[PDB]
């Protein structure tokens, strides 16, 4: 029933009975759905985004695994074990090595699903039915943000020579110094974690503004070459 669903019921109604019938069927099925929730009720709560104390420990243990994997890569850098393959420098090999080690596993959903009652959780149901939101949104709220990536790379040390922020030392090797956010939104980000999220968040806002203007100039040139 979703909008833009090719092969959905409304696309089929249009194919057999006409697009006007599909429009009338969208409205009619919409009224049925809305009149049902008029009795069923649907809500979202702060407790819908809250992990149980057992699942919060499970998520903490997962992140500690990612930090240890990042820490071992550092120990391979302290001892010079980092041997870049052909085509990449040691910095490039180390940076892509850290990005892979700090990626969340698929099993991060296990603590989230343990805390969630799927048949009653409004946040899960909105995500799971395609109404709004996605799985990364749910993980970020409940479990953890993970690694901030801008242009498929970590936070570059732009504050100073070898420094990402004033809160981190020069040539810091901790994953947190380069955009890894161990916290979730519900847990609340710290000051340096929040700054990295702002850089990533502002980056999306800039991309939205620049893409629309860049596409608009291309759109007009496309129109005039093709309008005839």
């Amino acid at each position: 029933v979703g909008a833009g669903s090719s092969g959905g019921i409304y696309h089929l109604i249009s194919r057999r009975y006409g697009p006007q019938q599909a429009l009338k069927m969208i409205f009619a099925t919409q009224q049925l759905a809305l009149n049902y929730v008029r009795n069923a009720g649907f809500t979202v709560s702060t407790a819908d985004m809250l992990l149980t104390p057992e699942a919060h420990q499970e998520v903490q243990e997962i992140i500690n695994e990612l930090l240890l994997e990042s820490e071992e890569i550092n120990n391979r850098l302290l001892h010079g074990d980092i041997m870049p393959p052909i085509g990449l420098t040691t910095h490039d090999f180390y940076e892509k090595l850290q990005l892979n080690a700090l990626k969340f596993p698929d099993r991060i959903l296990k603590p989230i699903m343990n805390s969630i009652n799927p048949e009653t959780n409004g946040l899960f149901q909105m995500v799971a039915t395609g109404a709004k939101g996605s799985n990364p949104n749910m993980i970020h709220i409940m479990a953890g943000i993970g690694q901030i990536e801008i242009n498929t790379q970590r936070i570059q040390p732009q504050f100073s020579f070898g420094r990402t922020l004033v809160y981190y030392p020069r040539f810091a090797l901790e994953a947190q110094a380069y955009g890894f956010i161990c916290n979730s939104y519900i847990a609340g980000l710290t000051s340096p974690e929040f700054i990295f999220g702002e850089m990533n968040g502002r980056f999306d806002l800039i991309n939205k503004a620049l893409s629309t203007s860049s596409t608009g100039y291309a759109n007009r040139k496309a129109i005039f070459g093709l309008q005839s």
């Binding site: 006007q20 429009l23 969208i26």
Partner: protein, 76 residues
């Protein structure tokens, strides 16, 4: 340029008989229906030429004038 005679005056146009407002949701409207507030409905007009087949339908509009809705405010 964008403000020049070609792009602003020729390829675009400022027009009459048009309204603008904030949009909002109405689940009781069909997908091909738009909710038009009555104040705008009296501002914007539909030109109906009077003939034998529509004279009786057009009379209630003509009698209402500006005082009553559905009314009318002009005659050519």
């Amino acid at each position: 340029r964008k403000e020049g005679r070609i792009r602003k005056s020729l390829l675009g146009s400022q027009v009459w008989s048009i309204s603008r407002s904030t949009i909002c949701g109405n689940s009781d409207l069909h997908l091909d229906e738009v909710g038009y507030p009555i104040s705008f409905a009296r501002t914007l007009q539909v030109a109906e030429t009077v003939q034998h087949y529509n004279i009786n339908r057009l009379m209630p509009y003509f009698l209402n004038g500006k005082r009553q809705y559905p009314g009318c405010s002009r005659v050519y």
